[PDB]
Amino acid sequence: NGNSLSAAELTCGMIMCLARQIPQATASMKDGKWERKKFMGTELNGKTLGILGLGRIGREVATRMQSFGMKTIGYDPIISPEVSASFGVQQLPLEEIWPLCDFITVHTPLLPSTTGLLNDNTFAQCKKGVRVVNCARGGIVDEGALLRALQSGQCAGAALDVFTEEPPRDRALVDHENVISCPHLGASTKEAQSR
Amino acid sequence: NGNSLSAAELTCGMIMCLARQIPQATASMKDGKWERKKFMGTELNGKTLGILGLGRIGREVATRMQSFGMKTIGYDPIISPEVSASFGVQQLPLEEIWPLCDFITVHTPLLPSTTGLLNDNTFAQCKKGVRVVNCARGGIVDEGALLRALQSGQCAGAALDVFTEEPPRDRALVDHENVISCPHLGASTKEAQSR
Ligand SMILES: Nc1cccc(-c2cnco2)c1
Ligand SMILES: Nc1cccc(-c2cnco2)c1
């Protein structure tokens, strides 16, 4: 609420980091290397961003990424398509969403219906090379499925602020070359923390 | 031109990375650590972004960061203020800009007048804790002055895609904890490279 923008801003940051491999590039430069071909990226302009959860934070994400010329689609079980259209988000049924997305970002609570929202079934329905962002709640994205999709190239990268267990005991996602991560910093700004 | 957006997008990426230390946080997590207090960040909303150079790229940067609620001011010797006003950028004389900025980004050519545009004289006129981005040309930001301002805290962080020498032989900027960097990736997208 008072932390909505901190969240949304971190989420946008993560999307940009996935598109250009900025954290990897920095680690590469810090290791004394100059690796330009390794870190060829993609432009966000004209890409499709799927936003699952169209509450305050997903809303704020959307209007920010619209400025980059991203197409913003999404799904929310409660919010009407005409309301979401009012902030530039095209609602489609979930099965329509998976194949269209170059990027997917989750902004849901952690419920039985959202636990493993992204799982081996839904990664298969994605376009090959999808990039995923979870800055919401650990578990929304199934961590095993994600690892499997990063291994196969079905998922080309992921950005995680949150984990099923915090700190994460299983290190295979954090250690993957295409995964960027933070220690649950979504609300960690001076402003959010400081009313 | 065809690479304007790739540049602008990397610049916005770097600004977000400075605000939230996503590269440093990723390296921290990769090293098995969970360091939440270390990576307290700042919100962009309500901050002032100074854009020095208001060509196509600086323009594109501006309209992106306006969506995050940044105030966008700038300076360009050639672009009219009425043109800059058309995309939400308030032109002030350079002496007016330095004290106002939370963030400063450079989008100029490398000329005698812009070599060391940011130098010890202009860092001293900055607000304490300014963050700086150079995704334009190596040398616009004086590298010695920058290091000095990082050492004192006058500059709270920098993001560099370019260096006076590439690859950089002097490693003190790249190695600084508050510096993020890439091997000149501003134009390295599939789209930019692929007309
Ligand atoms: N199944 C599914 C998909 C997308 C959003 C959500 C959601 C958000 N608020 C409660 O549930 C649920
Ligand atoms: N000194 C200064 C400051 C900001 C922009 C410029 C600039 C842009 N295009 C030619 O020079 C120069």
CSV table of C-alpha atoms and ligand atoms in Angstrom, one decimal:
chain,number,residue,atom,x,y,z
A,1,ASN,CA,0.0,0.0,0.0
A,2,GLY,CA,2.6,2.5,1.3
A,3,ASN,CA,5.0,-0.2,-0.1
A,4,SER,CA,3.2,-0.7,-3.5
A,5,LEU,CA,5.5,1.5,-5.4
A,6,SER,CA,8.7,0.0,-3.8
A,7,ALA,CA,7.4,-3.3,-5.0
A,8,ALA,CA,6.4,-2.3,-8.4
A,9,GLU,CA,9.7,-0.5,-8.9
A,10,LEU,CA,11.8,-3.5,-7.9
A,11,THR,CA,9.6,-5.7,-10.3
A,12,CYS,CA,10.3,-3.2,-13.2
A,13,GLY,CA,14.0,-3.3,-12.2
A,14,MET,CA,14.0,-7.1,-12.4
A,15,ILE,CA,12.4,-7.1,-15.8
A,16,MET,CA,15.1,-4.7,-17.1
A,17,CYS,CA,17.8,-6.9,-15.5
A,18,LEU,CA,16.5,-9.9,-17.3
A,19,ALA,CA,16.3,-8.2,-20.6
A,20,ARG,CA,20.0,-7.0,-20.5
A,21,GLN,CA,21.8,-9.3,-18.0
A,22,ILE,CA,23.0,-6.4,-15.9
A,23,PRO,CA,23.7,-8.3,-12.8
A,24,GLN,CA,25.7,-11.0,-14.7
A,25,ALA,CA,27.5,-8.3,-16.8
A,26,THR,CA,28.6,-6.6,-13.5
A,27,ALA,CA,29.8,-9.9,-12.0
A,28,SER,CA,31.7,-10.6,-15.3
A,29,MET,CA,33.4,-7.0,-15.2
A,30,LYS,CA,34.2,-7.5,-11.5
A,31,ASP,CA,35.9,-10.8,-12.4
A,32,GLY,CA,38.3,-8.9,-14.8
A,33,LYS,CA,36.5,-10.0,-17.9
A,34,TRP,CA,35.2,-8.1,-21.0
A,35,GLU,CA,32.6,-10.4,-22.4
A,36,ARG,CA,30.5,-8.6,-25.0
A,37,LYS,CA,29.1,-11.5,-27.1
A,38,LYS,CA,28.0,-13.5,-24.0
A,39,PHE,CA,25.7,-10.6,-22.9
A,40,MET,CA,23.7,-9.8,-26.1
A,41,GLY,CA,20.2,-8.9,-24.8
A,42,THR,CA,16.7,-8.0,-26.0
A,43,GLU,CA,14.7,-4.8,-26.2
A,44,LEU,CA,11.5,-4.5,-24.2
A,45,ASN,CA,9.8,-2.2,-26.7
A,46,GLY,CA,7.1,-4.3,-28.6
A,47,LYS,CA,7.4,-7.3,-26.2
A,48,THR,CA,4.5,-8.8,-24.3
A,49,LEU,CA,4.3,-8.6,-20.5
A,50,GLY,CA,1.8,-10.9,-18.7
A,51,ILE,CA,0.8,-9.6,-15.3
A,52,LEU,CA,-1.0,-12.3,-13.2
A,53,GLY,CA,-2.7,-10.2,-10.4
A,54,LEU,CA,-4.0,-6.8,-11.3
A,55,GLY,CA,-4.2,-5.2,-7.9
A,56,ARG,CA,-2.4,-2.0,-7.0
A,57,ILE,CA,1.1,-3.4,-7.5
A,58,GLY,CA,0.5,-5.1,-10.8
A,59,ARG,CA,-1.4,-1.9,-12.0
A,60,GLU,CA,1.7,0.2,-11.2
A,61,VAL,CA,4.0,-2.3,-12.9
A,62,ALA,CA,1.8,-2.1,-15.9
A,63,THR,CA,1.8,1.6,-16.4
A,64,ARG,CA,5.5,1.8,-15.9
A,65,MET,CA,6.2,-1.0,-18.5
A,66,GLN,CA,3.7,0.5,-21.0
A,67,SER,CA,6.2,3.5,-21.1
A,68,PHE,CA,8.8,1.1,-22.6
A,69,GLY,CA,6.3,0.1,-25.3
A,70,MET,CA,5.5,-3.3,-23.8
A,71,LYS,CA,2.1,-4.8,-24.6
A,72,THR,CA,0.6,-5.5,-21.2
A,73,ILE,CA,-1.9,-8.4,-20.9
A,74,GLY,CA,-3.0,-10.1,-17.8
A,75,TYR,CA,-5.4,-12.0,-15.7
A,76,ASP,CA,-7.2,-11.4,-12.4
A,77,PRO,CA,-10.1,-13.5,-11.2
A,78,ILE,CA,-12.0,-10.5,-9.6
A,79,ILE,CA,-11.1,-7.4,-11.7
A,80,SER,CA,-13.3,-6.9,-14.9
A,81,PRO,CA,-11.7,-6.6,-18.4
A,82,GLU,CA,-13.2,-3.1,-18.9
A,83,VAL,CA,-11.6,-1.9,-15.6
A,84,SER,CA,-8.2,-3.4,-16.5
A,85,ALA,CA,-8.5,-1.9,-20.0
A,86,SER,CA,-8.7,1.5,-18.2
A,87,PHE,CA,-5.1,1.1,-17.2
A,88,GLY,CA,-4.0,-0.5,-20.4
A,89,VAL,CA,-4.1,-4.2,-19.4
A,90,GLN,CA,-5.8,-6.6,-21.8
A,91,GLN,CA,-7.4,-9.4,-19.9
A,92,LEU,CA,-7.4,-12.9,-21.3
A,93,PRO,CA,-8.1,-16.2,-19.8
A,94,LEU,CA,-5.0,-17.8,-18.4
A,95,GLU,CA,-4.7,-20.4,-21.1
A,96,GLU,CA,-4.5,-17.5,-23.7
A,97,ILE,CA,-1.8,-15.7,-21.7
A,98,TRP,CA,0.9,-18.4,-21.5
A,99,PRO,CA,1.7,-18.7,-25.2
A,100,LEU,CA,1.8,-14.8,-25.8
A,101,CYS,CA,4.2,-13.7,-23.1
A,102,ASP,CA,7.8,-12.8,-23.5
A,103,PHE,CA,7.9,-11.9,-19.8
A,104,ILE,CA,5.6,-13.0,-16.9
A,105,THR,CA,5.3,-11.3,-13.6
A,106,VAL,CA,3.2,-12.5,-10.6
A,107,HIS,CA,1.3,-10.2,-8.2
A,108,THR,CA,-1.0,-12.5,-6.3
A,109,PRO,CA,-1.4,-13.6,-2.8
A,110,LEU,CA,-0.2,-17.1,-1.8
A,111,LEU,CA,-3.3,-19.3,-2.0
A,112,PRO,CA,-4.0,-22.9,-3.0
A,113,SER,CA,-5.0,-21.6,-6.5
A,114,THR,CA,-1.8,-19.6,-6.8
A,115,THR,CA,0.7,-22.0,-5.3
A,116,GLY,CA,2.6,-23.4,-8.4
A,117,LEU,CA,0.6,-21.0,-10.6
A,118,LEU,CA,3.7,-21.5,-12.8
A,119,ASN,CA,4.4,-25.2,-12.9
A,120,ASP,CA,5.6,-27.8,-15.4
A,121,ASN,CA,2.0,-27.7,-17.1
A,122,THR,CA,2.0,-23.9,-17.5
A,123,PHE,CA,5.7,-23.6,-18.6
A,124,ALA,CA,4.9,-26.0,-21.3
A,125,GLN,CA,2.2,-23.7,-22.6
A,126,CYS,CA,4.7,-20.7,-22.6
A,127,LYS,CA,6.6,-19.5,-25.6
A,128,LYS,CA,10.1,-20.9,-25.6
A,129,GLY,CA,12.5,-18.5,-23.9
A,130,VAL,CA,10.0,-16.8,-21.6
A,131,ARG,CA,11.5,-14.8,-18.8
A,132,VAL,CA,9.8,-14.8,-15.4
A,133,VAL,CA,9.7,-12.4,-12.4
A,134,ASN,CA,8.5,-13.3,-8.8
A,135,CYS,CA,8.6,-10.3,-6.5
A,136,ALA,CA,5.4,-11.3,-4.7
A,137,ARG,CA,5.3,-14.4,-2.6
A,138,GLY,CA,7.6,-17.4,-2.5
A,139,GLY,CA,5.9,-20.5,-4.0
A,140,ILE,CA,3.8,-18.8,-6.6
A,141,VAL,CA,6.3,-20.1,-9.1
A,142,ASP,CA,7.0,-23.8,-8.5
A,143,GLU,CA,10.8,-23.8,-7.8
A,144,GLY,CA,11.4,-27.3,-9.2
A,145,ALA,CA,9.4,-26.5,-12.4
A,146,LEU,CA,11.4,-23.3,-12.8
A,147,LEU,CA,14.7,-25.1,-12.5
A,148,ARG,CA,13.6,-27.6,-15.0
A,149,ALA,CA,12.4,-24.9,-17.4
A,150,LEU,CA,15.8,-23.0,-17.0
A,151,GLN,CA,17.6,-26.3,-17.7
A,152,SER,CA,15.8,-26.9,-20.9
A,153,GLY,CA,15.8,-23.3,-22.2
A,154,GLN,CA,12.0,-23.2,-22.1
A,155,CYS,CA,12.5,-20.4,-19.5
A,156,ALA,CA,15.5,-18.1,-20.7
A,157,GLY,CA,15.8,-16.4,-17.3
A,158,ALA,CA,14.1,-15.7,-14.0
A,159,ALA,CA,14.3,-13.0,-11.3
A,160,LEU,CA,13.4,-13.9,-7.7
A,161,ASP,CA,12.9,-11.6,-4.7
A,162,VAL,CA,11.1,-14.3,-2.8
A,163,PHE,CA,11.5,-18.1,-2.1
A,164,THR,CA,9.4,-21.0,-0.7
A,165,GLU,CA,12.0,-21.0,2.1
A,166,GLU,CA,13.8,-17.7,3.2
A,167,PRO,CA,16.8,-17.8,3.2
A,168,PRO,CA,16.7,-20.5,0.5
A,169,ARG,CA,18.2,-23.8,1.6
A,170,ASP,CA,18.1,-25.2,-2.0
A,171,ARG,CA,20.7,-23.3,-4.0
A,172,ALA,CA,20.1,-24.6,-7.6
A,173,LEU,CA,17.9,-21.7,-8.6
A,174,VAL,CA,20.0,-19.0,-7.0
A,175,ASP,CA,23.2,-20.5,-8.5
A,176,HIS,CA,21.8,-20.7,-12.1
A,177,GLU,CA,23.6,-18.3,-14.6
A,178,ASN,CA,20.2,-17.0,-15.9
A,179,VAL,CA,18.7,-16.3,-12.4
A,180,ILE,CA,19.0,-13.0,-10.7
A,181,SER,CA,17.9,-12.6,-7.2
A,182,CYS,CA,17.6,-10.4,-4.1
A,183,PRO,CA,17.0,-11.2,-0.3
A,184,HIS,CA,13.3,-10.2,-0.4
A,185,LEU,CA,14.0,-6.5,-0.9
A,186,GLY,CA,10.7,-5.5,-2.4
A,187,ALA,CA,9.6,-3.4,0.5
A,188,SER,CA,13.2,-2.4,1.6
A,189,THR,CA,13.3,1.3,0.7
A,190,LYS,CA,13.9,4.2,3.0
A,191,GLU,CA,10.5,5.6,1.9
A,192,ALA,CA,8.5,2.4,2.4
A,193,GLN,CA,10.1,1.7,5.8
A,194,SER,CA,9.8,5.3,6.8
A,195,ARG,CA,6.2,6.7,6.9
B,1,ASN,CA,18.8,5.8,-34.1
B,2,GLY,CA,17.8,2.2,-34.7
B,3,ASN,CA,19.7,1.7,-31.4
B,4,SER,CA,18.2,4.6,-29.5
B,5,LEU,CA,15.8,2.5,-27.6
B,6,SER,CA,18.3,-0.1,-26.7
B,7,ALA,CA,20.5,2.6,-25.2
B,8,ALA,CA,17.7,4.4,-23.4
B,9,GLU,CA,16.4,1.0,-22.1
B,10,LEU,CA,19.8,0.1,-20.7
B,11,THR,CA,20.1,3.6,-19.1
B,12,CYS,CA,16.7,3.1,-17.3
B,13,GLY,CA,17.9,-0.3,-16.3
B,14,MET,CA,21.0,1.2,-14.8
B,15,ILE,CA,19.0,3.8,-12.9
B,16,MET,CA,16.8,1.1,-11.4
B,17,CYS,CA,19.9,-1.0,-10.5
B,18,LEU,CA,21.4,2.0,-8.7
B,19,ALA,CA,18.2,2.6,-6.8
B,20,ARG,CA,17.9,-1.0,-5.6
B,21,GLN,CA,21.5,-2.6,-5.9
B,22,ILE,CA,20.1,-5.6,-7.8
B,23,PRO,CA,23.5,-6.6,-9.3
B,24,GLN,CA,25.2,-6.4,-5.8
B,25,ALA,CA,22.2,-8.3,-4.2
B,26,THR,CA,22.4,-11.0,-6.9
B,27,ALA,CA,26.1,-11.5,-6.2
B,28,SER,CA,25.4,-11.6,-2.5
B,29,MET,CA,22.8,-14.3,-2.9
B,30,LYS,CA,25.1,-16.2,-5.3
B,31,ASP,CA,27.7,-16.2,-2.5
B,32,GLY,CA,25.2,-17.9,-0.2
B,33,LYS,CA,24.4,-14.8,1.8
B,34,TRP,CA,21.1,-13.2,2.9
B,35,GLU,CA,21.9,-9.6,3.5
B,36,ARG,CA,18.7,-7.6,3.8
B,37,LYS,CA,20.0,-4.5,5.8
B,38,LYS,CA,23.0,-4.1,3.4
B,39,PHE,CA,20.7,-3.6,0.5
B,40,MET,CA,18.1,-1.1,1.8
B,41,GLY,CA,17.4,1.1,-1.3
B,42,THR,CA,15.4,4.1,-2.5
B,43,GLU,CA,12.3,4.8,-4.4
B,44,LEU,CA,12.5,6.6,-7.7
B,45,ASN,CA,9.1,8.2,-7.4
B,46,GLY,CA,9.4,11.9,-6.5
B,47,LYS,CA,13.2,12.0,-7.2
B,48,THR,CA,14.9,14.3,-9.6
B,49,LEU,CA,16.6,13.0,-12.7
B,50,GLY,CA,19.0,15.3,-14.6
B,51,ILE,CA,19.4,14.4,-18.2
B,52,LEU,CA,22.5,16.1,-19.8
B,53,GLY,CA,21.9,15.8,-23.6
B,54,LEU,CA,18.3,15.9,-24.8
B,55,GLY,CA,18.6,14.1,-28.1
B,56,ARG,CA,16.5,11.1,-29.1
B,57,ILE,CA,18.0,8.9,-26.4
B,58,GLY,CA,17.8,11.4,-23.5
B,59,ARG,CA,14.2,12.1,-24.6
B,60,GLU,CA,13.3,8.4,-24.5
B,61,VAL,CA,14.9,8.0,-21.1
B,62,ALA,CA,12.9,11.0,-19.9
B,63,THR,CA,9.5,9.7,-20.9
B,64,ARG,CA,10.3,6.3,-19.4
B,65,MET,CA,11.4,7.6,-16.0
B,66,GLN,CA,8.5,10.1,-15.9
B,67,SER,CA,6.2,7.0,-15.6
B,68,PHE,CA,8.1,6.2,-12.4
B,69,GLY,CA,7.2,9.7,-11.1
B,70,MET,CA,10.7,11.1,-11.5
B,71,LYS,CA,11.0,14.9,-12.0
B,72,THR,CA,13.0,15.3,-15.3
B,73,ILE,CA,15.1,18.3,-15.8
B,74,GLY,CA,18.0,18.7,-18.1
B,75,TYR,CA,20.3,20.7,-20.2
B,76,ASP,CA,21.2,20.7,-24.0
B,77,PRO,CA,23.0,23.6,-25.7
B,78,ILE,CA,21.4,23.0,-29.1
B,79,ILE,CA,17.8,21.6,-28.3
B,80,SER,CA,15.2,24.4,-27.7
B,81,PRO,CA,13.4,24.4,-24.3
B,82,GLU,CA,10.1,24.4,-26.2
B,83,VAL,CA,11.1,21.0,-27.8
B,84,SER,CA,12.2,19.7,-24.4
B,85,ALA,CA,9.1,20.9,-22.8
B,86,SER,CA,7.2,18.8,-25.4
B,87,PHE,CA,8.5,15.7,-23.7
B,88,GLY,CA,8.3,16.9,-20.1
B,89,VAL,CA,11.9,18.0,-19.6
B,90,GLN,CA,12.5,21.3,-17.8
B,91,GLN,CA,15.6,23.0,-19.1
B,92,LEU,CA,17.8,24.8,-16.7
B,93,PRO,CA,21.3,26.2,-16.9
B,94,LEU,CA,23.9,23.6,-15.8
B,95,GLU,CA,24.7,25.4,-12.6
B,96,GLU,CA,21.0,25.2,-11.6
B,97,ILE,CA,20.9,21.4,-12.4
B,98,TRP,CA,23.7,20.0,-10.2
B,99,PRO,CA,22.3,20.8,-6.7
B,100,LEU,CA,18.8,19.5,-7.6
B,101,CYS,CA,19.6,16.0,-8.9
B,102,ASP,CA,19.2,12.7,-7.2
B,103,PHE,CA,20.3,11.0,-10.3
B,104,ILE,CA,22.3,12.3,-13.3
B,105,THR,CA,22.5,10.6,-16.7
B,106,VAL,CA,24.6,11.7,-19.7
B,107,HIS,CA,23.5,11.6,-23.3
B,108,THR,CA,26.1,13.7,-25.2
B,109,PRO,CA,28.9,13.2,-27.6
B,110,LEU,CA,32.5,13.2,-26.5
B,111,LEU,CA,33.7,16.7,-27.2
B,112,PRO,CA,36.2,19.0,-25.4
B,113,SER,CA,33.2,20.6,-23.8
B,114,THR,CA,31.8,17.3,-22.5
B,115,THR,CA,35.0,15.5,-21.5
B,116,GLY,CA,34.8,15.7,-17.8
B,117,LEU,CA,31.4,17.2,-17.9
B,118,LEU,CA,31.2,15.5,-14.4
B,119,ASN,CA,34.5,16.4,-12.7
B,120,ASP,CA,35.6,17.5,-9.3
B,121,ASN,CA,34.1,21.0,-9.7
B,122,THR,CA,30.7,19.7,-10.8
B,123,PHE,CA,30.5,16.8,-8.2
B,124,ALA,CA,31.1,19.5,-5.6
B,125,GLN,CA,28.0,21.4,-6.7
B,126,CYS,CA,25.9,18.2,-6.6
B,127,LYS,CA,23.7,17.1,-3.7
B,128,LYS,CA,25.4,14.7,-1.4
B,129,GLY,CA,24.6,11.1,-2.4
B,130,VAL,CA,24.0,11.7,-6.1
B,131,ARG,CA,23.9,8.7,-8.3
B,132,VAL,CA,25.3,8.8,-11.8
B,133,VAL,CA,24.8,6.9,-15.0
B,134,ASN,CA,27.1,6.9,-18.1
B,135,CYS,CA,25.7,4.9,-21.0
B,136,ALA,CA,27.0,7.3,-23.6
B,137,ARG,CA,30.7,7.8,-24.2
B,138,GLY,CA,33.7,6.9,-22.0
B,139,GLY,CA,35.3,10.2,-20.6
B,140,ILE,CA,32.2,12.3,-20.1
B,141,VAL,CA,32.4,11.4,-16.5
B,142,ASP,CA,36.0,12.0,-15.3
B,143,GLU,CA,37.0,8.6,-13.9
B,144,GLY,CA,39.3,10.0,-11.2
B,145,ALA,CA,36.7,12.5,-10.1
B,146,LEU,CA,34.1,9.8,-9.9
B,147,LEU,CA,36.3,7.6,-7.8
B,148,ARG,CA,37.0,10.5,-5.5
B,149,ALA,CA,33.3,11.2,-5.2
B,150,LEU,CA,32.5,7.5,-4.5
B,151,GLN,CA,35.2,7.5,-1.8
B,152,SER,CA,33.8,10.5,0.1
B,153,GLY,CA,30.1,9.5,-0.4
B,154,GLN,CA,29.4,12.7,-2.4
B,155,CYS,CA,28.4,10.1,-5.2
B,156,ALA,CA,26.5,7.2,-3.6
B,157,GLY,CA,26.8,5.1,-6.7
B,158,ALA,CA,27.5,4.9,-10.4
B,159,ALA,CA,26.6,2.8,-13.4
B,160,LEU,CA,29.0,2.7,-16.3
B,161,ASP,CA,28.6,1.0,-19.7
B,162,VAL,CA,31.5,2.9,-21.2
B,163,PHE,CA,35.1,3.8,-20.0
B,164,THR,CA,37.9,6.2,-21.1
B,165,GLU,CA,39.8,3.0,-22.0
B,166,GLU,CA,37.9,-0.3,-23.1
B,167,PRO,CA,38.4,-2.7,-21.5
B,168,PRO,CA,39.3,-0.5,-18.5
B,169,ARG,CA,43.0,-1.0,-17.4
B,170,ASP,CA,42.4,0.9,-14.1
B,171,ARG,CA,40.1,-1.4,-12.0
B,172,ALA,CA,39.3,0.9,-9.1
B,173,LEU,CA,35.9,2.1,-10.4
B,174,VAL,CA,34.8,-1.4,-11.6
B,175,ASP,CA,35.9,-2.9,-8.3
B,176,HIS,CA,34.0,-0.3,-6.1
B,177,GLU,CA,31.0,-1.8,-4.2
B,178,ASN,CA,28.7,1.0,-5.4
B,179,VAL,CA,29.6,0.8,-9.1
B,180,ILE,CA,27.6,-1.4,-11.5
B,181,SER,CA,29.0,-2.0,-15.0
B,182,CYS,CA,28.7,-3.7,-18.3
B,183,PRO,CA,31.1,-4.3,-21.2
B,184,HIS,CA,29.6,-1.5,-23.4
B,185,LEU,CA,26.3,-3.3,-24.0
B,186,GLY,CA,24.2,-0.1,-24.8
B,187,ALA,CA,23.6,-1.2,-28.4
B,188,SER,CA,23.9,-5.0,-27.9
B,189,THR,CA,20.4,-6.2,-28.5
B,190,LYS,CA,19.1,-8.7,-31.1
B,191,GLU,CA,16.8,-6.0,-32.4
B,192,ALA,CA,19.5,-3.1,-32.6
B,193,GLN,CA,22.0,-5.4,-34.2
B,194,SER,CA,19.4,-6.9,-36.5
B,195,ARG,CA,17.7,-4.4,-38.8
C,1,LIG,N1,-5.4,-18.3,-10.4
C,1,LIG,C1,-5.1,-16.9,-10.4
C,1,LIG,C2,-4.4,-16.3,-11.4
C,1,LIG,C3,-4.1,-14.9,-11.4
C,1,LIG,C4,-4.4,-14.2,-10.2
C,1,LIG,C5,-5.0,-14.9,-9.1
C,1,LIG,C6,-5.3,-14.1,-7.9
C,1,LIG,C7,-5.2,-12.8,-7.5
C,1,LIG,N2,-5.9,-12.6,-6.4
C,1,LIG,C8,-6.4,-13.7,-6.0
C,1,LIG,O1,-6.1,-14.8,-6.9
C,1,LIG,C9,-5.4,-16.2,-9.2
C,2,LIG,N1,28.0,20.9,-21.8
C,2,LIG,C1,26.9,20.1,-22.2
C,2,LIG,C2,26.0,19.7,-21.4
C,2,LIG,C3,24.9,19.0,-21.8
C,2,LIG,C4,24.8,18.6,-23.2
C,2,LIG,C5,25.8,19.0,-24.1
C,2,LIG,C6,25.7,18.6,-25.5
C,2,LIG,C7,24.8,17.9,-26.1
C,2,LIG,N2,25.0,17.9,-27.4
C,2,LIG,C8,26.1,18.6,-27.6
C,2,LIG,O1,26.7,19.1,-26.4
C,2,LIG,C9,26.9,19.8,-23.6
